[PDB]
Write a protein that binds this ligand. Structure first.
Ligand SMILES: *[C@@H]1O[C@H](CO)[C@@H](O)[C@H](O)[C@H]1NC(C)=O
Ligand SMILES: *[C@@H]1O[C@H](CO)[C@@H](O)[C@H](O)[C@H]1NC(C)=O
Lengths: 48, 199
């Protein structure tokens, strides 16, 4: 009925009506680094 | 206010940056920028140190920080060839304008064609002289002019050399006039003009 990963969470599932097999990928996430010359040099920034 | 460079003369189609700079006498949001063609009332381009006014092309962009600020022109056009002013609020009482950086953007490169003119019968019978030396078809306005008889008369307090006229020939032009007595036309056996250009 379910697939499993190391964390004991669903890596995949079977749909209870259509019975096809769905992977689960977590929705995209990451850090938000701000690249800055010092404030004494400029107030401009880039974002990664 | 400081504004730089004193003229900005890059080719059309490029990116070109004007700067506006100040002492701590002024406040950071209230910078603005203006266009003036010859003899016209100025036109508001930028306000808020970065916002375009409505009806200004998206190729203009203002930016800055503290007391160092800029206007970048991009995708330059012959319509940009004008004097450009920044201005800033003097914190509360007073309004202060920049230098008026002439956007003398690249047209051609050329040395002057030259014509030289002695005094004439109507001018002399009217009791006067004025010797004329004419320069045209040049770019930039790199011109220097000197009067001679045939040694030197450029020391004369009555010599004049008007500001340069730009043209549909993608080039500047200018004139020097050496006004004199009719007795100078009787004195000097020849009149001449010499020109230095491109450096
Ligand atoms: C659920 O209903 C659909 C449509 O009637 C059918 O195709 C499917 O086989 C049913 N699944 C189960 C588990 O009964
Ligand atoms: C601070 O910035 C100014 C220019 O904005 C620079 O002249 C100065 O050297 C800087 N000082 C330090 C310690 O970063």
């Amino acid at each position: 009925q379910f697939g499993r990963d190391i964390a004991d969470t669903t890596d995949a599932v079977r749909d209870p009506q259509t019975l096809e097999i769905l992977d689960i990928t977590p929705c995209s996430f990451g850090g938000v680094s701000v690249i800055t010359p010092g404030t004494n040099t400029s107030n401009q920034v880039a974002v990664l | 206010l400081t504004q730089s460079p004193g003229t900005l003369s890059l080719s059309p189609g490029e990116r070109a940056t004007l700067s506006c700079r100040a002492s701590q006498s002024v406040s950071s949001s209230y910078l603005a920028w203006y266009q003036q063609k010859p003899g016209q009332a100025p036109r508001l381009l930028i306000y808020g140190a970065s916002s375009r006014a409505t009806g200004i092309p998206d190729r203009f962009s203002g930016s800055g920080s503290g007391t160092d600020f800029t206007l970048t022109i991009s995708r330059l056009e012959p319509e940009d060839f004008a004097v450009y002013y920044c201005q800033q609020y003097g914190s509360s009482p007073t309004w202060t304008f920049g230098q008026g950086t002439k956007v003398e953007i690249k047209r051609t490169v050329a040395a002057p064609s030259v014509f030289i003119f002695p005094p004439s019968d109507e001018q002399l019978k009217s009791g006067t002289a004025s010797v004329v030396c004419l320069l045209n078809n040049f770019y930039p306005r790199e011109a220097k002019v000197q009067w001679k008889v045939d040694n030197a008369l450029q020391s004369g307090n009555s010599q004049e050399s008007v500001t340069e006229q730009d043209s549909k020939d993608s080039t500047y032009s200018l004139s020097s006039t050496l006004t004199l007595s009719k007795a100078d036309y009787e004195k000097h056996k020849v009149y001449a003009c010499e020109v230095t250009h491109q450096g």
